[PDB]
Amino acid sequence: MNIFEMLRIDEGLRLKIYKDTEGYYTIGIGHLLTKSPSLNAAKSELDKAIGRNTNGVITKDEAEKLFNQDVDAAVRGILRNAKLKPVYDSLDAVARAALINMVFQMGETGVAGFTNSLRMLQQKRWDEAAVNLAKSRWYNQTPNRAKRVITTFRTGTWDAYK
Numbered sequence: 001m002n003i004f005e006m007l008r009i010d011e012g013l014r015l016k017i018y019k020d021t022e023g024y025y026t027i028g029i030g031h032l033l034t035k036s037p038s039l040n041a042a043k044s045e046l047d048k049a050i051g052r053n054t055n056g057v058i059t060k061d062e063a064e065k066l067f068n069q070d071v072d073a074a075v076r077g078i079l080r081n082a083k084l085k086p087v088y089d090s091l092d093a094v095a096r097a098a099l100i101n102m103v104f105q106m107g108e109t110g111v112a113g114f115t116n117s118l119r120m121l122q123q124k125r126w127d128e129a130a131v132n133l134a135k136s137r138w139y140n141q142t143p144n145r146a147k148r149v150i151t152t153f154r155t156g157t158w159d160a161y162k
């Protein structure tokens, strides 16, 4: 298991524009197109992202390309974030994948605000961090996914994904 397989499980794969859990226009493997309520706006962002007139449909290879770009972006964002980097550097490889997953879902900003959980993770207070991570809108809105990520940090294994 690795970050790609992990995210593929959590986000799924869709080849036509769809609305995410928050009601936003998305495509592929969790690639957010826009928060705008306009489908035309979404179609426009899609074409600009792909480099062609898609008409709201993309191929599997195109989806995977956006996916690679998005994972790369997430890691790079973590590494440039003053609050995130030190946490990431302190973690084992499995737990690092859990941090990337949260950044991919909620953005660098979203994550950087879990101040208390981050400190606990950096201190390796696993169980406490798990409890603190759960007291969040994130966990209450997407509980199954949040439980998988939380378990990943807590145990340092991929068991929630097998």
Ligand SMILES: [Cl-]
Binding pocket: 049
């Ligand atoms: Cl893009």
Ligand SMILES: [Cl-]
Binding pocket: 141, 142, 143, 144, 145, 146
């Ligand atoms: Cl969920």
